[PDB]
Design a protein around this ligand. Sequence first.
Ligand code: CLA
Ligand code: CLA
Ligand code: CLA
Ligand code: CLA
Ligand code: CLA
Ligand SMILES: CC1=C(/C=C/C(C)=C/C=C/C(C)=C/C=C/C=C(C)/C=C/C=C(C)/C=C/C2=C(C)CCCC2(C)C)C(C)(C)CCC1
Lengths: 97, 37, 244, 56, 36, 168, 170, 137, 442
Amino acid sequence: ELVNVVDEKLGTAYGEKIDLNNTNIAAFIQYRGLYPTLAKLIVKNAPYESVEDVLNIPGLTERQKQILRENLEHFTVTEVETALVEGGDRYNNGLYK
Amino acid sequence: KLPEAYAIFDPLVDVLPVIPVLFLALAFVWQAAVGFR
Amino acid sequence: QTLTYDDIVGTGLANKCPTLDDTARGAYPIDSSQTYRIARLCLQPTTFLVKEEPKNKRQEAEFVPTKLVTRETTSLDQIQGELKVNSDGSLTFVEEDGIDFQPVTVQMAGGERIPLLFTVKNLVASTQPNVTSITTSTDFKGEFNVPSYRTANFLDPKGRGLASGYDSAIALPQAKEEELARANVKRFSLTKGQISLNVAKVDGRTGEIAGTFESEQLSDDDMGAHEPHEVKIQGVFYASIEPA
Amino acid sequence: GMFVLPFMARLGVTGSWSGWSITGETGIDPGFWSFEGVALAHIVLSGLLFLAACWH
Amino acid sequence: METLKITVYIVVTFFVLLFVFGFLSGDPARNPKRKD
Amino acid sequence: EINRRVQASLASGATLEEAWSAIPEKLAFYDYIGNNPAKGGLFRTGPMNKGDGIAQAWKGHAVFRNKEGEELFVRRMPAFFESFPVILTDKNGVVKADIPFRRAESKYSFEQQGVTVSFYGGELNGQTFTDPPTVKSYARKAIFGEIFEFDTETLNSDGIFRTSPRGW
Amino acid sequence: LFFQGFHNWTLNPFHMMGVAGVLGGALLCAIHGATVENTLFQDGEGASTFRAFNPTQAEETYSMVTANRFWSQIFGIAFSNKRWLHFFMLFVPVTGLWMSAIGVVGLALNLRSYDFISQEIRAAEDPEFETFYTKNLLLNEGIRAWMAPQDQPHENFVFPEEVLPRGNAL
Amino acid sequence: AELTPEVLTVPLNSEGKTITLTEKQYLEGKRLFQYACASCHVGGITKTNPSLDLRTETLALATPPRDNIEGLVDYMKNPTTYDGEQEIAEVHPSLRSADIFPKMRNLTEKDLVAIAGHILVEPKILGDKWGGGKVYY
Amino acid sequence: GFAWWAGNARLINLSGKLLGAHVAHAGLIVFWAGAMTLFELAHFIPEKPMYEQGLILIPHIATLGWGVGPGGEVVDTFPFFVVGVVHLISSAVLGFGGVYHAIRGPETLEEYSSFFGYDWKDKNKMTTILGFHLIVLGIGALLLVAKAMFFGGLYDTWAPGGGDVRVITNPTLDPRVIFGYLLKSPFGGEGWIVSVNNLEDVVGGHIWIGLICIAGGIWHILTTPFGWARRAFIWSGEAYLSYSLGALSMMGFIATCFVWFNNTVYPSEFYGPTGPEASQAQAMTFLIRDQKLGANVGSAQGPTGLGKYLMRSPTGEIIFGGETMRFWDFRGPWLEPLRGPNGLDLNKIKNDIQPWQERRAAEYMTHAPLGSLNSVGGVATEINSVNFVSPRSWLATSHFVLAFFFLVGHLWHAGRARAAAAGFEKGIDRESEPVLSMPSLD
Ligand code: CLA
Ligand code: CLA
Ligand code: CLA
Ligand code: CLA
Ligand code: CLA
Ligand SMILES: CC1=C(/C=C/C(C)=C/C=C/C(C)=C/C=C/C=C(C)/C=C/C=C(C)/C=C/C2=C(C)CCCC2(C)C)C(C)(C)CCC1
């Protein structure tokens, strides 16, 4: 009844895709065209009901929409986990090299 | 770098700052010669 | 006229909110239409009260006073947010950003340290309906979030944590772990608090207001290690309003 | 099993420097003549008398 | 606290002046051999 | 030796359950670091039972598999180490799962690799666990070698290894 | 550094007695040499006082009496017996080294003073309890995990990034 | 093992053309990289933004691709963000910003090539250590 | 009576040979100033910050306003050359007087002229020599004032626009300010005279000290010591040397802290950032980096509950978070624009950080005064690559070492001087042992 919610989140798609609702912003560097600019937008406009909501971020250039489309299969959304989004941890989670 | 007309003495200058040290070494050569009197 | 850093530094006035002249008994009127922001909301606490635990049934222990031990580090400031007009004339302030948290530890009688995250994070505070003017009888009431005092990376003294750290008591390799689950599994608490803001001074010329606040919230639960205390915070506040 | 605590209480010493009193009231400043300060004073006294014993 | 601060200021100044004046009182002359 | 016996129980027909149930508990209990005399401490006094407890039963030999059905091996703690991390490997030595310290970039977590533990022989013979915290828990013990049930109450055992008469 | 991280050798009372013997010995060496050099008798006219000793002189070359009064008044106790003094100077560093040897014999068997059981039981139960003793074990734990693979190549330790113990940011 | 031509052979452009450095160029580039770059990029990391490193896989995924001599020489001329969207000459050493980054003032065109060369060869020699950080020291 | 290894003690009552010792040694000092400067210029490369280059003397010259313009950009190297040459040349003249007085001149001076001769025990002659040197020192301090006010100014790291040379037209004369420094606490946030943070106060204090030194120089020429001073001091050459060794030691400890903390008369442009400066620059750097990515740095709670980027000091000022909380007393020209009267202003941080501040912070963070003895820069676990130890680390450590031994030297000579004055420096008289005529303690 006492669960580590972070470990439990590694058993979800959070453990295999970039989770648009939870993943730190540094993960948007593993796919091209996404960092810093779209990463910044995705994070600020979170949370997302489903992966396809990213395309409804206002202000998107059609080039930006193309890159997001190109990468939707690398995204997921799970429920927001407080522990991963509090403390500005999506912008800086304590991990460098 | 030094002004060009002194270009010449560049390697003398790489050595000058150590000369004060030589004076301490020199005091021991003098005392060796006089028998540590 | 105002002061420079070098006048303030080391005095303790950096932890004090700006105050209003005792003459400032005005009113700031509200264009039902035009929009408004709070450009600066400052909350300075003056008193920390912790609820005791009464041990029996129908005694319900009291709010007892406490000694601060973390110094002039307590004030929330530079806060801002939307100030809306609802259909019925209630105003709602919606916090956006600011230095909206301070860790504090107060000491109860008998030595117990009680840490807490004095915060107004995500505050939404409303007025009664039919405002039309902010006056020296306007009250805001609202609620805010209180995240866990430590965030996820925090490592207890044995290296155990939630987003980092050991998942067991490594110094007790063959100990029975069920005794220790509460200490081994860290949990991230997220609770609500409540706050009243009582306007008592208004500069109708400048849009500045000031007064008193009381908030109630929970103390640190050390990532689930132990039960929290209830905390009541009293202090003073100041805010400036702008046509957005 | 407090033996000496009631003899301090009996003649007026009721609070501790940690802020509690035997009456149950929190937030009390007893000044020096708390349970702690009475104990201190007896240790200091004991030590002065020890030195007086050596002189004599 | 201010009572305490004043007291410590007094105690320290007292001891420091004992030191300054003690050494100003012909200290070189307090030796076993030769006194000035 | 233990593996020599299972290997030969199996070539000779027997099932996995049967090959391990054939392992005497006394031999399995030697294959446990808590009886290693080099695991004690100078001021950790008394009988070894005061530390890990009074051994009651062999629980069974624990077999870990990932989500691809690969059999994984817990790296055993060396005697030098008071603590040791939990790392699982394939028959070739490649890391395929572990218990991460930092979670945010972990890639080999039990949750991600879908690690399961099955038991052959002993008390837990023919039982499989899939819930991550349970699997991790036996993984934590498998670094000590074979897994035993202890009575910690009778002596109020504190859970810290002591040395043996050979050590003292 | 191996012995710190793996044996927690600083915590070992036999090492501590050794430290006290080596440092105690260095102290004795310095304090005795300085005392003789500043209780010297005036046995020559020159400002270099070394010239005024003769290896076959019978007379002590410094005053034990003045030395003793000095240290008695400065420290409270002093040596009065030259023989005991020089025996003590043999005794202190020899014993310290002997004590540390015993402790390393314990460590031949991993028989360490690694832990204090009472601290661990409290700290397992009480995540607010922290001492310099718990702080230093975290350091030992970092040491072991960070040096072990390159320091014990025969063990083929592969610690992936995610298993290394690390505090925040570093 | 030694510094062979196979290792000294790095992509020139994204077409796929290759270029083979000399040992001279390689040691030229290393020297220059220590002079102009190592203060932030020692070992292929970026001390002032650790999220972006000089591993070849990272450069390969930058916009425009930087895993080749051309992309890197261009970067030293007109650096951009990882997604290509903004020019960052104001805050990154570059020839375009040598008025404010004076170390770039004496870098000639072949110096740029040696530097870009060093960056592409070093991962082949050092492996994960390059851009890996202290974990691999 | 002295052995060869204490042979310079043989000069104590040979005023002529001892004059040569001092003047020859003064030539060694001027020689090194000259030679070292020319070595640094030979090796100087202008495109590289000075503090990447091992320079300790060029930075002292630039600081007086020579050879540099706005930003510490080196504009003209000739002043550096000139300073070296004139020093190097002048040391030959001092070398010459030195070997002459030490080997050929009169061993003792007092028979030649009664002006230059002295006896250590002549309290009047000694205060007169003291006074002449006080006036010289006073003159020197006014030389600095003259350069600042009449001959080009000084480099002012604080000058608006990134730093520049500036003439000082209004030196601080107010003694409440000048001597106020002398009474600030030496502890943190106060920092005694090390906190002087503007050139008006630096020039003004050198006016005071020049005048004070001239005044006192004339005082000591004109007076003889009073009786209370006669009876409290030891009057001997060794005793005077011991007094000066203590003063040198104290001064060396002050200079250590000066070069480690002060970024006004040791501009960071030339010497590298201070430890505190570099530490603040890292928090600035990631604050900038994270805010650009969208982080709200004011509301971001860090692991501990304290702000991840910003927190309060114990008196409430808004300050940089993390371990650098300890360095919030730091003030530097790249940072102060962000400061309001409650400390760091959140609205200036959000809106008004300039690229030159992002640049300066990145640079100072990567040039922190940490380095190995063999000049590998960075924390001690860093790999080889970057050849760098900050001039401030070299200057702080060298002078701490020197200051320490000079204190030992002071104790050594002061004790000896006492015992020599009372007549027991060579040991105890066996026939008159003081302790054997004293009562037993017990
Ligand atoms: C060769 C000697 C020897 C050995 C190897 C053993 C071995 C053992 N005994 Mg036995 N025992 C012995 C002698 C021995 N005993 C003697 C002589 C007695 C009577 C006193 C006993 C009485 C006894 C009892 C009552 C019990 C045991 C038990 C045990 C077991 C646990 C031991 C333990 O915790 O030690 C702990 C060891 C230490 C904490 C180390 C102590 C040594 C200190 C650190 C050295 C002192 C330092 C010194 C002051 C330094 C100064 C020097 C300098 C100033 C010059 C173990 C199998 C226990 C058990 O489990 O039995 C069922 C048990 O209960 N033993
Ligand atoms: C202003 C500085 C100053 C002055 C003028 C003097 C003057 C004197 N001292 Mg004092 N002294 C000083 C500072 C000073 N001292 C300091 C700072 C210390 C503490 C270390 C001492 C400690 C001291 C002692 C212990 C003694 C003196 C003595 C003396 C007298 C004889 C000294 C002699 O002949 O040395 C001769 C010089 C040498 C033998 C050479 C020493 C070389 C040093 C130790 C090596 C330094 C090398 C360097 C660090 C690196 C080398 C690099 C390599 C390439 C060579 C003379 C009156 C003697 C005395 O009391 O007589 C009255 C005596 O016994 N001094
Ligand atoms: C700054 C360093 C320094 C200085 C200035 C002096 C100066 C002096 N010493 Mg000391 N001394 C020193 C270091 C120093 N010493 C050290 C390190 C030691 C320990 C080894 C000693 C040990 C020592 C002893 C044991 C004695 C002295 C004595 C003397 C004095 C007489 C020397 C004499 O007649 O020699 C004559 C020497 C020569 C004729 C040889 C040639 C020396 C010349 C000067 C070399 C200079 C060359 C230079 C490059 C020329 C440039 C010329 C140009 C400027 C025109 C003289 C004032 C003596 C004294 O007090 O006499 C009463 C004495 O007995 N010294
Ligand atoms: C503080 C250092 C100092 C001191 C106290 C002395 C003291 C003395 N010297 Mg020595 N001398 C010195 C430095 C010093 N000299 C130097 C540096 C040199 C080499 C240039 C000499 C060369 C020298 C010689 C060759 C002779 C003496 C002689 C004498 C004696 C007679 C002086 C006299 O009447 O001259 C008359 C005075 C003057 C002409 C006034 C000179 C004014 C000077 C040039 C200007 C001073 C301004 C300023 C201080 C310099 C700084 C400028 C610079 C920073 C740019 C006297 C005891 C004589 C002696 O003892 O014979 C037995 C002798 O023959 N000296
Ligand atoms: C190189 C500097 C120097 C030296 C060595 C001397 C040496 C001397 N002076 Mg002169 N003096 C000087 C400069 C100097 N003076 C200057 C510039 C002036 C002008 C202001 C004077 C004015 C002066 C007067 C008016 C008198 C002397 C006197 C004396 C003699 C007694 C000194 C004494 O007891 O001090 C020891 C000092 C004390 C016992 C009290 C000082 C307490 C201070 C405040 C302690 C502070 C130390 C602290 C750690 C550092 C921080 C500083 C603080 C202010 C913040 C002595 C020969 C006396 C004498 O006999 O003259 C004929 C005398 O009456 N001096
Ligand atoms: C320049 C400058 C300035 C100024 C300065 C000044 C003005 C200073 C002063 C200083 C001073 C003003 C000092 C003083 C000093 C003093 C001392 C240091 C003392 C000492 C003493 C002693 C040593 C004594 C002792 C004794 C005793 C106690 C008893 C008896 C015996 C005897 C006598 C021994 C400023 C900062 C503004 C800025 C920058 C620049």
